[PDB]
Write a protein that binds this DNA or RNA. Structure first.
Ligand SMILES: [Mn+2]
Ligand SMILES: [Mn+2]
Ligand SMILES: [Mn+2]
Length: 430
DNA sequence: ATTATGACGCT
DNA sequence: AGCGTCATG
């Protein structure tokens, strides 16, 4: 009762750019705006592999991981933009630079955690307390929440999307106790006001639209963000969790979409997040380990404590290329040439990073995949990264992997390599 | 022949 | 340190 911690001590938002790489390309080329369009890597094999899809194209069933030729079967008028190719490989610099644009705007409102190229968590707890003290106890107008959905509302005793959104928002605001600076629902509402402002700033200053979730923790904020896309934000209150989770497939919660979530389903004989509440913490720890078990016990009640880490920059800077089927690397000259291509891209990105961010990487990780291996990485080896020089990094990577060539001939490489990966890690301030 | 990233947990 | 999992623009 009075000592049951309810995990309502923070306001956390997740901001995620809508179909991000597509928006980057649509900003650059107005002919692609408000069209079914997708972003592809490469072109020769099956028209290229789609990695981002505008919402107009999604309506035709176009998805990521689809070959462009197949997408064109679903959507003959689909427009395509191709990722830049540099040194023989896809180069994602344009999207990384656009990401920095957005992250720098978000950082004006609060410290952020970069979770991906297109998304960041925000801890708004302090900004909410400030805005509440500024509000002097006056209530929150629906006009301050023009794109906000309140999950679970309207309910109880209009057939248009926007009409329903406004009905739910009015029910929410009507029930608010705007005199209590410690009410979690009020705190979330003010958080949503701030996120409206943040999203407006992003769109005004970049042209990019985003969606967002506002809740008491990272998992609920991410889940909330997905509920009303594109270009909308969703507030998931603590009180909304029992109904929300009662029909929520376990795989929808971040970290449960793979083998662990499948094992929760199979071992416990359940389907939905809410069904987890019927197990004790010890039962869940017995099946899934002490850490997972405690996390599941709290998560299915809407409670999670993972902090928004103060980190706007990536921890690693890496370069990767697959060599599938008949293009696998089977000679030493080939392996060396591609290691050099990767290392040259890595050098360029590292040198820019050192100038921008006042840090230097100190470890080089070299990863390969060998033909016949079912795993995505067949071997990982680290060595020292003491100089931002591509020829040195590629020679070092070759040295750490050369013992993998099972061939007796040193000119040939067997079995051929289907993946090279160079990653710079362990940054230090400089 | 999804491909190219990047974070994090385990031992 | 090296491996596996989870994520999916
Ligand atoms: Mn996105
Ligand atoms: Mn995202
Ligand atoms: Mn996505």
């Amino acid at each position: 009762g009075p000592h049951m911690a309810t995990g309502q001590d923070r306001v956390v938002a997740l901001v995620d750019m809508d179909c991000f790489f597509v928006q980057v390309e649509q900003r650059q080329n107005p002919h692609l705006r408000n069209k079914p369009c997708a972003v592809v890597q490469y072109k020769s094999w099956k028209g290229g592999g789609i990695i981002a899809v505008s919402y107009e194209a999604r309506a035709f069933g176009v998805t990521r991981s689809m070959w462009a030729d197949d997408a064109k079967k679903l959507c003959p008028d689909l427009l395509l933009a191709q990722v830049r190719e540099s040194r023989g490989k896809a180069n994602l610099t344009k999207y990384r630079e656009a990401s920095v644009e957005v992250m720098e705007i978000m950082s004006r409102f609060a410290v952020i955690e970069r979770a991906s190229i297109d998304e960041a968590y925000v801890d708004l707890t302090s900004a909410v307390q400030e805005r509440l003290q500024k509000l002097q106890g006056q209530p929150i107008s629906a006009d301050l929440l023009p794109s906000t959905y309140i999950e679970g509302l309207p309910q109880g005793p209009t057939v248009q999307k926007e009409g329903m959104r406004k009905q739910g928002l009015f029910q929410w605001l009507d029930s608010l106790q705007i005199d209590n600076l410690t009410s979690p629902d009020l705190q979330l509402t003010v958080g949503a006001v701030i996120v409206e402002e943040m999203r407006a700033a992003i769109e005004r200053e970049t042209g990019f639209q985003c969606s967002a979730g506002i809740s008491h923790n990272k998992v609920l904020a991410k889940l909330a963000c997905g509920l009303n896309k594109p270009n909308r934000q969703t507030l998931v209150s603590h009180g909304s969790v029992p109904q929300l989770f009662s029909q929520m497939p376990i795989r929808k919660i971040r970290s449960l979409g793979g083998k662990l979530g499948a094992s929760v389903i199979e071992i416990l004989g359940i389907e939905y997040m809410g069904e987890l509440t019927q197990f004790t913490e010890s039962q869940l720890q017995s099946h899934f380990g002490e850490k997972n078990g405690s996390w599941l016990y709290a998560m299915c009640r809407g409670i999670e404590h993972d902090p928004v880490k103060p980190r706007q920059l990536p921890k690693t800077i890496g370069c990767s290329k697959n060599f599938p089927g008949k293009t696998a690397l089977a000679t030493r000259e080939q392996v060396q040439w591609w290691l050099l291509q990767l290392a040259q891209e890595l050098e360029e990105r590292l040198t820019k990073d050192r100038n921008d961010n006042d840090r230097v990487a100190t470890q080089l990780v070299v990863s390969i995949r060998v033909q016949g291996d079912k795993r995505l990485s067949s071997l990982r080896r680290c060595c020292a990264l003491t100089r931002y020089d591509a020829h040195k990094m590629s020679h070092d990577a070759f040295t750490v992997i050369k013992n993998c060539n099972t061939s007796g001939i040193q000119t040939e490489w067997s079995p051929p390599l289907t993946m090279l990966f160079l990653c710079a890690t362990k940054f230090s301030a400089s």
